Design an enzyme around this catalytic site. Structure first.
Site, short mmCIF file in Angstrom:
data_model
loop_
_atom_site.label_atom_id
_atom_site.label_comp_id
_atom_site.label_asym_id
_atom_site.label_seq_id
_atom_site.Cartn_x
_atom_site.Cartn_y
_atom_site.Cartn_z
N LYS F 9 37.05 46.08 40.87
CA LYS F 9 37.13 44.75 40.29
C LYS F 9 35.72 44.14 40.18
O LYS F 9 34.80 44.55 40.91
CB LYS F 9 38.08 43.90 41.13
CG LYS F 9 39.53 44.39 41.01
CD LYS F 9 40.39 44.02 42.20
CE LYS F 9 40.32 42.54 42.55
NZ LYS F 9 41.25 42.22 43.66
N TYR F 49 48.24 42.78 34.44
CA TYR F 49 48.74 41.84 35.45
C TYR F 49 50.03 41.18 34.98
O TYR F 49 50.48 40.19 35.57
CB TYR F 49 47.71 40.73 35.71
CG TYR F 49 46.44 41.16 36.38
CD1 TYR F 49 46.22 40.89 37.73
CD2 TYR F 49 45.42 41.79 35.66
CE1 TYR F 49 45.01 41.23 38.35
CE2 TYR F 49 44.21 42.14 36.27
CZ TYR F 49 44.01 41.86 37.61
OH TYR F 49 42.82 42.21 38.21
N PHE F 57 49.06 32.08 40.47
CA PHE F 57 47.86 32.89 40.68
C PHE F 57 47.21 33.39 39.39
O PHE F 57 45.98 33.39 39.28
CB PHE F 57 48.08 34.05 41.69
CG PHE F 57 49.12 35.06 41.28
CD1 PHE F 57 49.94 34.88 40.17
CD2 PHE F 57 49.27 36.23 42.03
CE1 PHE F 57 50.89 35.84 39.81
CE2 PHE F 57 50.22 37.20 41.69
CZ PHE F 57 51.03 37.01 40.58
N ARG F 85 45.66 54.45 48.33
CA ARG F 85 45.97 53.12 48.85
C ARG F 85 45.75 53.02 50.36
O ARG F 85 45.26 52.02 50.86
CB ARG F 85 47.39 52.68 48.46
CG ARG F 85 48.46 53.73 48.66
CD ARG F 85 49.60 53.58 47.64
NE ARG F 85 50.44 52.41 47.87
CZ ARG F 85 50.24 51.22 47.29
NH1 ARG F 85 49.23 51.05 46.45
NH2 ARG F 85 51.07 50.22 47.55
N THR F 91 46.26 45.06 51.02
CA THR F 91 45.83 44.17 49.94
C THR F 91 44.86 43.08 50.44
O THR F 91 43.78 42.89 49.88
CB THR F 91 47.03 43.53 49.17
OG1 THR F 91 47.99 44.54 48.83
CG2 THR F 91 46.54 42.92 47.89
N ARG F 102 38.22 47.87 51.70
CA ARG F 102 38.56 46.46 51.80
C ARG F 102 38.19 45.82 53.14
O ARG F 102 37.55 44.77 53.18
CB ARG F 102 40.04 46.27 51.50
CG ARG F 102 40.39 46.58 50.05
CD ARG F 102 41.81 46.24 49.77
NE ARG F 102 42.10 46.23 48.35
CZ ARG F 102 43.31 46.49 47.85
NH1 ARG F 102 44.32 46.78 48.66
NH2 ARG F 102 43.50 46.46 46.54
N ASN F 112 39.05 41.43 46.07
CA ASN F 112 38.87 42.50 47.06
C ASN F 112 38.40 43.81 46.45
O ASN F 112 39.19 44.67 46.06
CB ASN F 112 40.18 42.73 47.82
CG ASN F 112 41.37 42.90 46.90
OD1 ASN F 112 42.00 43.96 46.86
ND2 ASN F 112 41.67 41.86 46.13
N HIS F 115 40.87 48.22 43.10
CA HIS F 115 42.27 48.19 42.70
C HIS F 115 42.76 49.64 42.58
O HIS F 115 42.03 50.50 42.11
CB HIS F 115 42.36 47.47 41.34
CG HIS F 115 43.69 47.58 40.67
ND1 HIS F 115 44.64 46.58 40.72
CD2 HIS F 115 44.26 48.60 39.98
CE1 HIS F 115 45.73 46.98 40.10
NE2 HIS F 115 45.52 48.20 39.64
N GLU F 126 48.75 52.94 34.23
CA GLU F 126 47.45 52.29 34.38
C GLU F 126 46.37 53.16 33.71
O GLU F 126 45.51 52.66 32.96
CB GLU F 126 47.12 52.06 35.86
CG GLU F 126 47.64 50.74 36.44
CD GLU F 126 47.25 50.53 37.91
OE1 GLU F 126 46.05 50.64 38.25
OE2 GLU F 126 48.15 50.25 38.74
#
Lengths: 149, 149, 149, 149, 149, 149
Positions: F9, F49, F57, F85, F91, F102, F112, F115, F126
């Protein structure tokens, strides 16, 4: 043994390079005799940079150090000051040997991560101006024998 | 934002882990608002460790912190104190999650590299005892926007 | 291909630099053909340091290697020995290029982290004295093609 | 103090992770009492992996260790073996806590970088099979006081 | 500011050095304006290596780049190209200053981790051939002020 | 083998964490099949998103990704997505296990660092939206045998 004054200019503090720049000297053998975040507050600057105040750089040079904080330090060991500058790197980061705090974390002579004495006299005049005499711990590092002899 | 007191006990300073332990928090986002080498000098100890002075550990615990120096610090940011202990690691290094300053650099509960507040109150009582009010720079880190929002 | 003897003197072993000093050569391409902790035990020293035994340093030099253990090694690849010393660093750590095992982890010529052959002959006489002929694995590193050609 | 046998399986040696995996324990406090490159040569395998030889994995498991070399080691300190496995990581690297030699350098349970004792007895039976009794240096690490107490 | 084309030759991609080689320039100040995995596919090679096609190396040189992928990149900042090669290292890795991507991760002139412009013109002809004009983000790095001035 | 989409990100790109975040997966075994700097440009965002666009948000979330660039990537290997992950971290960075991208480089759930896919389907939707089909190299990593079996 010999002591040396060397601090991290505003830029490095801001560039989160505080830790590494400290660590570099720890894993080298240099001993941290005192260190804090005492800002330049202009007055402290002008004196330290007193040399060549008539040079245009002062206008834009004293502006820099005075922005963000400054992690000042004093390091020990034999040839501490002599060797420091070697690993501190050349003044110009875009000309400093790759492996140094400058050639690894710096692209401009304006703000190049850290600062460090250019002679034992300059060392014996920088410590004083920024530190004092009591802020320095006289601790004997339990690991110094495996370095000198 | 929120502040937190956290220092490197004598051991880590001696184990040359000063830099890394500082750096860990820099590359995390925590902001170094002040930091130096102020030794415990016994008196400063007894008070800080005041809690459970009647416990046998005090005899051998206050002996430790008082040997070598102590790089004390104060860190900023939201949840600074909450998150710090998480990455500081569990108290016992031989039980602390691998990735922390303790589980990576510590094998004994006696002397485990660093120390850090256990609550905002404990944080708001440690800063004072070790620092003061002027030794702290109120610098705004030029990179804080890319962290919070 | 070409082999080279290079060990970590007592100091580095004690300064916990074993891993890094090994790793440096792994991520370089050099191949670890054998390695252990065989101490100098005096006799092994005097011979290895045989050259200039009449020089005063011997008194205080043979004292050093014989204290703590010594992680001895033998490395492979083309120009292994030639290149090794380059990255091993200059003999004097307070004069060795920053980026080397010496200029990064050494402040005294007395005990400077590691040791490594000064020629193919010196290499072909050090391996033998410290290793043997069977202690060496003749493994083919599954990743050597992406280095030479 | 307590000793523990732990080696780097063929894969890690090949994946150039020798140095890091050694270093991890150095900067932890564990002391390297002996270490070399003694291959499994089948016979040494079957015995070590003797447990559950009737299980299908043996066919394809004993094939693995026997390919490339194996940097075997023995480490010291209190809770050396207990703590080792914790930082060694879970057996399955695709299930091992991030921060360990496995969760950081391993994607398959087949060949997961290193191996290390599962109890003091298993430790006191692995050292012997791979090492001996003389290959181990009884050096006192000059830095052990800043860890235990 | 000034841009520069520099990619990781097939070898480095294969030697898992992608991350470090990228990172080196991030922590230097250089800004990543575009980057992907566009293979050479022969045609793209011959042109790029067009210079001295009559030299025997072409036979065995164009063979190399075309095997595995190639993480191509374009970097920004003042003296980006000038400084890049300095830290890229000398062409020959077994002759390149220790601290560079080459002297740290390369033992052969054949395949030496990365590639990078030798002048602003060569830079202004490499970007085009490999990138385009839209694949490049014109993002302003929120941290560039703490570098230049 | 299995592929997975995971990008850095805007924040991380800006926080100079591009290299490390790439490297983490290289030294893990995951294979970089394609990667570039394709910005979100709003439209690309809203869709990605798309889930819970009615949630507040979105107002402040779609604002974020669209600022600075985004180093998008696709990684290979068995359990690539499953394991990713795990090491990507929880998250919330102020709740993510220390050792992850993270918990090591993030103090806010807002921005963070990276992604990464939450399932093989989300992975297989994705990759497409951000990459294509030709931008991906089908290179066979010369070092994959020392990982799986």
């Amino acid at each position: 043994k010999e002591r040396t004054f060397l601090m991290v200019k505003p830029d490095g503090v801001q560039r989160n390079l505080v830790g590494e720049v400290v660590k570099r000297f720890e894993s080298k053998g240099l001993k941290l005799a005192g260190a804090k975040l005492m800002v330049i507050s202009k007055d402290g600057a002008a004196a330290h940079y007193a040399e060549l105040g008539g040079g245009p750089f002062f206008g834009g040079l004293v502006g820099g150090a005075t922005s963000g904080p400054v992690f000042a330090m004093v390091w020990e060991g034999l040839n501490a000051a002599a060797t420091a500058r070697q690993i501190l790197g050349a003044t110009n980061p875009s000309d400093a040997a790759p492996g140094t705090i400058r050639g690894d974390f710096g692209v401009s002579a304006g703000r190049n991560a850290i600062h460090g004495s250019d002679s034992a006299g300059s060392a014996a005049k920088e410590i004083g101006a920024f530190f004092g005499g009591g802020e320095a711990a006289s601790g004997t590092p339990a690991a110094a024998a495996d370095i000198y002899g």
